[PDB]
Every structure is written in structure tokens, then in C-alpha cells.
Coordinates of C-alpha atoms in Angstrom, one line a residue:
Chain A
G2 CA 24.6 1.6 -23.8
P3 CA 20.9 1.1 -23.6
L4 CA 18.9 4.2 -22.9
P5 CA 17.8 4.8 -19.3
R6 CA 14.2 4.2 -18.5
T7 CA 12.2 7.3 -17.6
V8 CA 10.6 7.1 -14.2
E9 CA 8.3 10.1 -13.3
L10 CA 7.4 10.9 -9.7
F11 CA 4.3 13.1 -9.2
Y12 CA 4.3 14.6 -5.8
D13 CA 3.0 17.4 -3.5
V14 CA 5.0 18.4 -0.4
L15 CA 1.7 18.3 1.6
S16 CA 1.8 14.5 1.2
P17 CA 3.8 12.5 3.7
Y18 CA 3.9 9.4 1.6
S19 CA 5.1 11.4 -1.4
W20 CA 8.2 12.3 0.7
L21 CA 8.9 8.7 1.5
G22 CA 8.6 7.5 -2.1
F23 CA 10.7 10.5 -3.2
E24 CA 13.6 9.6 -0.9
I25 CA 13.6 5.9 -2.0
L26 CA 13.6 7.0 -5.7
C27 CA 16.4 9.5 -5.1
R28 CA 18.4 6.8 -3.4
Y29 CA 18.3 4.6 -6.5
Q30 CA 18.6 7.3 -9.2
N31 CA 22.3 6.6 -9.7
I32 CA 22.2 2.9 -9.1
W33 CA 19.4 1.8 -11.5
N34 CA 19.5 2.8 -15.2
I35 CA 16.8 5.4 -14.9
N36 CA 16.1 9.0 -15.7
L37 CA 14.3 10.1 -12.6
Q38 CA 11.9 13.0 -13.5
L39 CA 10.4 14.9 -10.6
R40 CA 6.9 16.2 -11.4
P41 CA 5.7 18.9 -8.9
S42 CA 1.9 18.5 -8.7
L43 CA -1.1 19.8 -6.7
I44 CA -3.2 17.3 -4.7
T45 CA -6.2 19.7 -4.8
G46 CA -6.3 19.4 -8.6
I47 CA -6.6 15.6 -8.3
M48 CA -8.7 14.8 -5.2
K49 CA -12.2 14.2 -6.4
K54 CA -16.0 11.9 6.3
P55 CA -16.1 9.5 9.3
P56 CA -18.1 10.9 12.2
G57 CA -15.9 9.1 14.7
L58 CA -13.5 11.3 16.8
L59 CA -10.5 9.2 16.0
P60 CA -11.0 7.4 12.6
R61 CA -9.2 4.1 12.1
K62 CA -7.4 5.2 9.0
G63 CA -6.0 8.2 10.9
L64 CA -4.7 6.0 13.6
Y65 CA -3.2 3.7 11.0
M66 CA -1.3 6.6 9.3
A67 CA 0.0 7.8 12.6
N68 CA 1.3 4.3 13.5
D69 CA 2.6 3.7 10.0
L70 CA 4.7 6.9 9.7
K71 CA 6.2 6.0 13.1
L72 CA 7.4 2.6 11.7
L73 CA 8.4 4.1 8.4
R74 CA 10.5 6.8 10.0
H75 CA 12.8 4.0 11.3
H76 CA 12.4 1.6 8.3
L77 CA 13.3 4.2 5.8
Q78 CA 15.5 6.4 8.0
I79 CA 13.6 9.6 7.1
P80 CA 13.0 12.1 9.9
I81 CA 9.2 12.3 9.3
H82 CA 7.1 13.6 12.2
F83 CA 3.4 13.9 12.5
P84 CA 2.5 17.6 13.0
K85 CA 1.9 18.9 16.6
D86 CA -1.3 20.6 15.5
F87 CA -4.3 19.3 13.6
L88 CA -3.5 17.9 10.2
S89 CA -6.7 19.6 9.0
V90 CA -4.8 22.9 9.6
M91 CA -1.8 22.2 7.5
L92 CA -4.1 20.9 4.8
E93 CA -6.4 23.9 4.8
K94 CA -3.4 26.2 4.5
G95 CA -2.4 24.2 1.4
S96 CA 0.8 24.0 -0.6
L97 CA 0.0 26.3 -3.6
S98 CA 2.8 28.7 -3.3
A99 CA 5.3 26.0 -2.4
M100 CA 4.3 23.8 -5.4
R101 CA 4.3 26.8 -7.7
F102 CA 7.8 27.7 -6.4
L103 CA 9.0 24.1 -7.1
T104 CA 7.5 24.4 -10.5
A105 CA 9.5 27.6 -11.1
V106 CA 12.6 25.8 -9.9
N107 CA 11.9 22.9 -12.3
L108 CA 11.6 25.4 -15.2
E109 CA 14.7 27.5 -14.4
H110 CA 17.1 25.5 -12.2
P111 CA 16.1 21.8 -12.4
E112 CA 19.3 20.7 -10.8
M113 CA 18.1 22.3 -7.6
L114 CA 14.6 20.7 -7.6
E115 CA 15.6 17.6 -5.5
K116 CA 17.0 19.6 -2.6
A117 CA 14.4 22.3 -2.8
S118 CA 11.6 19.7 -2.6
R119 CA 13.4 18.0 0.3
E120 CA 13.8 21.2 2.3
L121 CA 10.1 22.0 1.9
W122 CA 9.2 18.5 3.2
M123 CA 11.6 19.1 6.1
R124 CA 9.6 22.2 7.1
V125 CA 6.1 20.8 6.8
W126 CA 6.7 17.1 7.6
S127 CA 9.7 17.1 9.9
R128 CA 9.8 20.4 11.9
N129 CA 6.1 21.4 11.7
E130 CA 7.0 24.7 10.1
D131 CA 4.9 26.9 7.8
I132 CA 5.3 26.6 4.0
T133 CA 2.7 29.2 2.8
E134 CA 4.6 32.4 3.7
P135 CA 7.1 33.9 1.4
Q136 CA 9.8 34.0 4.1
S137 CA 9.1 30.3 4.7
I138 CA 9.7 29.4 1.0
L139 CA 12.8 31.5 0.9
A140 CA 14.2 29.8 4.1
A141 CA 13.8 26.4 2.5
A142 CA 15.3 27.6 -0.8
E143 CA 18.4 29.0 0.9
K144 CA 18.8 25.8 2.9
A145 CA 18.8 23.9 -0.4
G146 CA 21.8 26.0 -1.4
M147 CA 20.2 28.6 -3.5
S148 CA 21.5 32.2 -3.4
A149 CA 19.2 34.8 -1.8
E150 CA 18.8 36.5 -5.2
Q151 CA 18.2 33.3 -7.0
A152 CA 15.5 32.3 -4.5
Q153 CA 14.0 35.7 -4.5
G154 CA 13.9 35.7 -8.3
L155 CA 12.1 32.4 -8.3
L156 CA 9.7 33.5 -5.6
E157 CA 8.6 36.4 -7.8
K158 CA 7.5 34.0 -10.6
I159 CA 5.1 32.0 -8.4
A160 CA 2.1 33.9 -9.8
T161 CA 3.2 34.1 -13.4
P162 CA 0.9 32.5 -16.1
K163 CA 3.8 30.3 -17.2
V164 CA 4.4 28.8 -13.8
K165 CA 0.7 28.6 -13.0
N166 CA 0.0 26.8 -16.3
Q167 CA 2.9 24.4 -15.9
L168 CA 1.7 23.3 -12.5
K169 CA -1.8 22.7 -13.9
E170 CA -0.4 20.8 -16.8
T171 CA 1.8 18.6 -14.6
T172 CA -1.1 17.9 -12.3
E173 CA -3.3 17.1 -15.4
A174 CA -0.7 14.6 -16.6
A175 CA -1.0 12.9 -13.2
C176 CA -4.8 12.7 -13.7
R177 CA -4.3 11.3 -17.2
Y178 CA -2.1 8.6 -15.7
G179 CA -5.0 7.6 -13.5
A180 CA -4.0 9.4 -10.3
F181 CA -6.6 9.4 -7.5
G182 CA -4.0 10.7 -5.0
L183 CA -0.3 11.2 -4.6
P184 CA 2.4 10.0 -4.9
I185 CA 2.2 8.3 -8.2
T186 CA 5.3 6.8 -9.9
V187 CA 5.1 6.2 -13.7
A188 CA 7.7 3.9 -15.3
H189 CA 8.1 3.8 -19.1
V190 CA 9.8 0.4 -19.7
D191 CA 9.7 -2.5 -22.2
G192 CA 7.2 -0.7 -24.4
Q193 CA 4.6 -0.1 -21.7
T194 CA 3.6 2.5 -19.2
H195 CA 2.9 1.5 -15.5
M196 CA 1.5 3.8 -12.8
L197 CA 2.2 2.8 -9.2
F198 CA 0.5 4.5 -6.3
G199 CA 2.1 5.2 -2.9
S200 CA 5.6 4.6 -1.4
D201 CA 5.4 0.9 -0.8
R202 CA 5.6 -0.4 -4.4
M203 CA 9.3 0.3 -5.1
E204 CA 10.2 -3.4 -5.1
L205 CA 7.6 -4.0 -7.8
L206 CA 9.1 -1.0 -9.7
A207 CA 12.5 -2.7 -9.5
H208 CA 11.0 -5.9 -11.0
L209 CA 9.3 -3.9 -13.8
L210 CA 12.7 -2.3 -14.6
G211 CA 14.6 -5.6 -14.3
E212 CA 16.7 -3.9 -11.6
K213 CA 17.9 -5.3 -8.3
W214 CA 15.9 -4.3 -5.2
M215 CA 18.2 -3.8 -2.2
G216 CA 15.6 -2.4 0.2
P217 CA 14.7 1.2 1.0
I218 CA 18.3 2.0 1.9
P219 CA 20.5 0.6 -0.8
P220 CA 24.3 0.4 -0.1
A221 CA 26.9 2.7 -1.6
Chain B
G2 CA 15.9 -21.8 21.2
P3 CA 14.1 -18.5 21.4
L4 CA 10.3 -18.8 21.0
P5 CA 8.8 -18.1 17.5
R6 CA 7.0 -14.8 17.1
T7 CA 3.3 -15.0 16.6
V8 CA 2.1 -13.4 13.4
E9 CA -1.7 -13.3 12.9
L10 CA -3.3 -13.0 9.5
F11 CA -6.9 -11.8 9.4
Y12 CA -8.5 -12.6 6.0
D13 CA -11.7 -13.1 4.1
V14 CA -11.7 -15.1 0.8
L15 CA -13.7 -12.3 -0.8
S16 CA -10.6 -10.1 -0.6
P17 CA -8.0 -10.4 -3.5
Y18 CA -5.3 -8.7 -1.5
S19 CA -5.9 -11.1 1.4
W20 CA -5.0 -14.0 -0.9
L21 CA -1.8 -12.2 -2.0
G22 CA -0.6 -11.5 1.6
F23 CA -1.6 -15.0 2.6
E24 CA 0.6 -16.6 0.0
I25 CA 3.6 -14.5 0.9
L26 CA 3.2 -15.3 4.6
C27 CA 2.7 -19.1 3.9
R28 CA 6.0 -18.9 1.8
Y29 CA 7.9 -17.6 4.8
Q30 CA 6.3 -19.7 7.5
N31 CA 9.1 -22.3 7.7
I32 CA 11.9 -19.8 6.9
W33 CA 11.3 -17.1 9.5
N34 CA 11.0 -18.0 13.2
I35 CA 7.3 -17.4 13.3
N36 CA 4.1 -19.0 14.4
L37 CA 1.8 -18.1 11.5
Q38 CA -1.8 -18.0 12.9
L39 CA -4.5 -17.8 10.3
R40 CA -7.6 -15.9 11.5
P41 CA -10.7 -16.4 9.3
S42 CA -12.7 -13.2 9.4
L43 CA -15.7 -11.4 7.8
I44 CA -15.2 -8.1 5.9
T45 CA -18.9 -7.2 6.5
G46 CA -18.3 -7.1 10.2
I47 CA -15.5 -4.6 9.8
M48 CA -16.4 -2.3 6.9
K49 CA -17.9 0.8 8.4
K54 CA -19.7 5.8 -4.0
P55 CA -18.1 7.6 -7.0
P56 CA -20.8 8.5 -9.7
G57 CA -18.3 7.9 -12.5
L58 CA -18.8 4.9 -14.7
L59 CA -15.2 3.6 -14.3
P60 CA -13.7 4.9 -11.0
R61 CA -10.0 5.5 -10.9
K62 CA -9.5 3.2 -7.9
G63 CA -11.3 0.4 -9.7
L64 CA -9.0 0.8 -12.7
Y65 CA -6.0 0.9 -10.4
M66 CA -7.0 -2.4 -8.8
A67 CA -7.5 -4.1 -12.2
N68 CA -4.0 -2.9 -13.3
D69 CA -2.4 -3.8 -10.0
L70 CA -3.7 -7.4 -9.8
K71 CA -2.4 -7.9 -13.3
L72 CA 1.1 -6.9 -12.3
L73 CA 0.9 -8.7 -9.0
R74 CA -0.1 -12.0 -10.6
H75 CA 3.3 -12.0 -12.3
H76 CA 5.3 -10.4 -9.5
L77 CA 4.0 -12.9 -6.9
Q78 CA 3.3 -15.8 -9.2
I79 CA -0.2 -16.3 -8.0
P80 CA -2.9 -17.1 -10.5
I81 CA -5.3 -14.3 -9.6
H82 CA -7.8 -13.2 -12.2
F83 CA -10.4 -10.5 -12.1
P84 CA -13.9 -12.0 -12.3
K85 CA -15.6 -12.1 -15.7
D86 CA -18.8 -10.6 -14.2
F87 CA -19.4 -7.5 -12.1
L88 CA -17.4 -7.5 -8.8
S89 CA -20.5 -6.1 -7.2
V90 CA -22.1 -9.5 -7.8
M91 CA -19.5 -11.6 -6.1
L92 CA -19.5 -9.1 -3.2
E93 CA -23.3 -9.1 -2.9
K94 CA -23.4 -12.9 -2.7
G95 CA -20.8 -12.6 0.1
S96 CA -18.6 -15.2 1.8
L97 CA -20.5 -16.0 4.9
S98 CA -20.8 -19.8 4.4
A99 CA -17.3 -20.0 3.2
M100 CA -15.8 -18.1 6.2
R101 CA -18.0 -20.1 8.6
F102 CA -16.7 -23.2 7.0
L103 CA -13.1 -22.1 7.4
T104 CA -13.9 -21.2 11.0
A105 CA -15.2 -24.8 11.4
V106 CA -12.0 -26.1 9.8
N107 CA -9.9 -24.0 12.2
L108 CA -11.7 -25.4 15.2
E109 CA -11.6 -29.1 14.2
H110 CA -8.8 -29.6 11.7
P111 CA -6.5 -26.6 11.8
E112 CA -3.8 -28.4 9.8
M113 CA -6.2 -28.2 6.8
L114 CA -6.9 -24.5 7.1
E115 CA -4.2 -23.3 4.8
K116 CA -5.2 -25.5 1.9
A117 CA -8.9 -25.1 2.5
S118 CA -8.5 -21.3 2.4
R119 CA -6.3 -21.5 -0.8
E120 CA -8.9 -23.6 -2.6
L121 CA -11.7 -21.2 -1.8
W122 CA -9.6 -18.3 -3.2
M123 CA -8.9 -20.5 -6.3
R124 CA -12.7 -20.6 -6.9
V125 CA -13.6 -17.0 -6.3
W126 CA -10.4 -15.2 -7.4
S127 CA -8.9 -17.6 -10.0
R128 CA -11.6 -19.5 -11.8
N129 CA -14.6 -17.2 -11.1
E130 CA -16.5 -20.0 -9.5
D131 CA -19.3 -19.7 -6.8
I132 CA -18.4 -20.0 -3.1
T133 CA -21.9 -19.7 -1.6
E134 CA -23.5 -23.0 -2.5
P135 CA -22.9 -26.1 -0.3
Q136 CA -21.6 -28.1 -3.3
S137 CA -19.1 -25.3 -4.0
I138 CA -17.7 -25.4 -0.5
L139 CA -17.5 -29.2 -0.6
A140 CA -15.7 -29.1 -4.0
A141 CA -13.0 -26.8 -2.5
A142 CA -12.7 -28.9 0.6
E143 CA -12.2 -32.1 -1.3
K144 CA -9.6 -30.4 -3.5
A145 CA -7.8 -29.4 -0.3
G146 CA -7.5 -33.1 0.5
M147 CA -10.4 -33.5 2.9
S148 CA -12.4 -36.7 2.8
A149 CA -16.0 -36.3 1.6
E150 CA -17.3 -37.3 5.1
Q151 CA -14.9 -34.9 6.8
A152 CA -15.9 -32.1 4.5
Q153 CA -19.6 -32.9 4.9
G154 CA -19.2 -33.0 8.7
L155 CA -17.7 -29.6 8.7
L156 CA -20.3 -28.2 6.3
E157 CA -23.0 -29.3 8.8
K158 CA -21.5 -27.1 11.5
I159 CA -21.5 -23.8 9.5
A160 CA -24.7 -22.7 11.2
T161 CA -23.9 -23.8 14.8
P162 CA -23.6 -21.2 17.6
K163 CA -20.1 -22.3 18.3
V164 CA -18.9 -21.6 14.7
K165 CA -21.0 -18.5 14.3
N166 CA -19.6 -17.0 17.5
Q167 CA -16.0 -17.9 16.7
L168 CA -16.2 -16.0 13.4
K169 CA -17.7 -13.0 15.1
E170 CA -15.0 -13.1 17.8
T171 CA -12.2 -13.4 15.3
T172 CA -13.6 -10.5 13.3
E173 CA -14.0 -8.5 16.5
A174 CA -10.3 -9.1 17.3
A175 CA -9.5 -7.7 13.9
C176 CA -11.5 -4.6 14.8
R177 CA -9.8 -4.3 18.1
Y178 CA -6.5 -4.3 16.3
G179 CA -7.7 -1.3 14.3
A180 CA -8.8 -3.0 11.1
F181 CA -10.7 -0.8 8.6
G182 CA -10.4 -3.5 5.9
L183 CA -8.6 -6.8 5.2
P184 CA -6.0 -8.2 5.2
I185 CA -4.4 -7.2 8.4
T186 CA -1.2 -8.9 9.6
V187 CA -0.5 -8.6 13.4
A188 CA 3.1 -9.2 14.6
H189 CA 3.8 -9.7 18.3
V190 CA 7.5 -9.0 18.6
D191 CA 10.1 -7.3 20.9
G192 CA 7.3 -6.6 23.4
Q193 CA 5.1 -4.7 21.0
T194 CA 2.1 -5.4 18.8
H195 CA 2.1 -4.1 15.2
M196 CA -0.8 -4.1 12.8
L197 CA 0.0 -3.9 9.0
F198 CA -2.7 -3.5 6.4
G199 CA -2.6 -5.0 2.9
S200 CA -0.2 -7.3 1.1
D201 CA 2.6 -4.9 0.3
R202 CA 4.2 -4.4 3.8
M203 CA 5.8 -7.8 4.1
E204 CA 9.4 -6.3 3.9
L205 CA 8.5 -4.0 6.8
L206 CA 7.2 -7.1 8.6
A207 CA 10.6 -8.8 8.0
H208 CA 12.4 -5.8 9.5
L209 CA 10.1 -5.8 12.6
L210 CA 10.9 -9.5 13.0
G211 CA 14.7 -9.0 12.4
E212 CA 14.3 -11.5 9.6
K213 CA 15.8 -11.5 6.1
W214 CA 13.5 -10.3 3.3
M215 CA 14.1 -12.3 0.1
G216 CA 11.2 -10.9 -2.0
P217 CA 7.7 -12.3 -2.4
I218 CA 9.1 -15.6 -3.7
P219 CA 11.8 -16.7 -1.3
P220 CA 14.2 -19.6 -2.4
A221 CA 14.1 -23.1 -1.0

């Protein structure tokens, strides 16, 4: 039959909306005729303040994630401590780990990514310490040795360069933030920003949109 | 039967995404059990730069409106001249006119608003000159005298104050930009930003989402 359309998702586990778009795409990956390609990326390679105590956009995000938790049925929870803190700690080791997973055991990438989001954006757990990464990896179903082997590659030139190259690809697609979803279909390439454009994606693909929680 | 839910749309004809959200809402106004309340507002009362020649977000908007023209079937066209120019000229008279229409002939507000968007965001026509406003009003189906009568009220304290008050209401709902859609349902008030959250709105209302172009 006709070849599946490649849909690339560029994401960083530090991004709440990246998780939301990720889950919607994963839900459609065996329904639509697509080749979902996960692209672990680093927001700090892309991103190029209000004096008010409680900025309007910050309030909006807090309210929005509350609604989207229910709408998408994803257990996303705003962190108990300052967002600034999670963000300052960063996701470098985590994204390098996911890059290593992509290179060695791509079939584990989806669950590994989900488990890291579950730490940072569901349970408010650290994702910068080695033990933290390993905990997520083992929850994803990786063996301790497998996870430890991948952990040891986080700082290798190959993994560091792959993450840079993937992040650069996002930039070349016009990314000003994550997530971006890139569909290659009908002889064109389309970049969509955020988690709220999946119905438009469906239309680009000529596929049926059944909402953020499609049936069996 | 149960009372319709009030859904407020705060908009400025200078905003392209306000037009898009407007049309989707107007399409559902007699399908869902809602009382659609149009709220003419002024972006300049709410809004509180990249050195690069062609900023990424500007490219994104250009590409996005191209896709959305087809997805929503709305004849939106990026202006031939600099956006900065349309924006510098502003929409003050136009939004005051629409405020006057809301106060005197609310049943004409939908078409009057549409015709002003058709000028600025479809045909790249001026919306600051009196003759421009009148042209849109007459296209909406207003009599020349009716339109002229409203035009003469643009600078009255009553109209000026109403526009300020409406814009202030948007601010009090947390607006950091337009459009915002405010649904009062199930004992809560929810503010949604932009034109891409209408499926979420449907879910809040317990109504069926049939895409941006619902059937008869």
C-alpha cells in the first residue's frame, strides 16, 4: 500500500506542552498511516521578563494545564516549587540519555520519554541526577544493565553531537520553541507548533480526527 | 429548557486570529446551546523586539494563516504592505464604530465586524478613514443614514467609555492578547486564548465538536 507519512516530533521533557502533543501523537501512531519519528531535542539550543509578580501568561498556563489534564486524560501537574528551579536545573542529562536510547534501543524511546515526563511533570521528581534517570529507565522496562550502559554514554561525543544535530534540525524547521511537529505529506513539509494543532495535522494528512483520545 | 451558556468573545479587527475564532463561534452559535456575546475590544488597552530581519514567529504566522485559510475556509490574506503599518494606523475608529453598533443595533454587530475584517485582513483595505468604515457598514446591510448616524457617535463619551470598559473586562479575565473566549458554564468561568481551543470549549460546554466547519 501507499507509504506512511513521516511525522517528526521534536520535544524536550522540560516542556509540559511537549508531553501533551507527544501523547496525542502516540495515540494515533497505529491509527493513521504515519511513521511517527521521535526527535529528542534541547530547548536551550533553540530559545533565542515581565516585572509583575504573577504574569498573565503564567496564570494562563497554570489554568490551561488544569483543563488539559482532564481534556487529554494525562496526569500533568504543575510543580510544587518554582518553575524557575526546574528550568534552571535543566534537562541536559535526560535529553542526552534519550538521545542514547534513540541510537541504541529506539523501541524503548517512547516509554523512556514518558517516564521522564512522569517524573518532572507529574510527580515533581528530579531528572538531573543519575539515579533519577536510571529510575525512569527501569520503570520504562529497561534492565538495570541496559539502563546503566546507556547512562554511561550520555557524555560521549556521538551522543552529544546527535542531540545538537537534532536540535539544529528543529531550528532549521523554524522552531522558536517546543514542541514542533513536522509532517512530510503531499510533497510539502509543514511545521506545527504546540499541542493544539493535531486536528490541523489530521487534515494535512487526510486522516480522520477523533479528538485527543481516539477509540480503540 | 435549560438556559443557554453565555460565551463571550473579546476581539479587535486588527487581530487575524480574532477573525478565525469569531467565524468558528458564529458557525456554532445556533448549533450549541449558547448565548454568543460579541465584545468589541482594543488590543492597545491590553498589550503590556527580535533584531533579526525575518523573525521565526513572523514566518510561523505567515505559514499558519496560509494553512488556516484552507482549513477554516476563511479568505484571510496577509497584507501586501508591512504589518507594522496596519498596526501603527490602528483600529480605534473601527472598534469604536463596532461599539456604537453593539449599543444601538446589536443584531448588525456580527456582519459589521466581518466586513471590517474583510477590509483589513482579506482585501488589504484601510479601516481608519470614515469612508472606509461606512463602506464596510453598508456592505453589512446598514442603510447609509444608519451607518452615518453611528459614525457620528464614534467620539462620544458613551461609546469611548463602553470600549474602555469592555477592554477592561478582557483584562480582568486575564487577557494578555486577543482573541479571548470566556465560557460561563457548570458554575465556573473559563478563559481560552486564541482560535485553536474551540474543541476544548466544546468539551467544557458538553457539546459535540464537529470541526471548524460544522454541517447544516
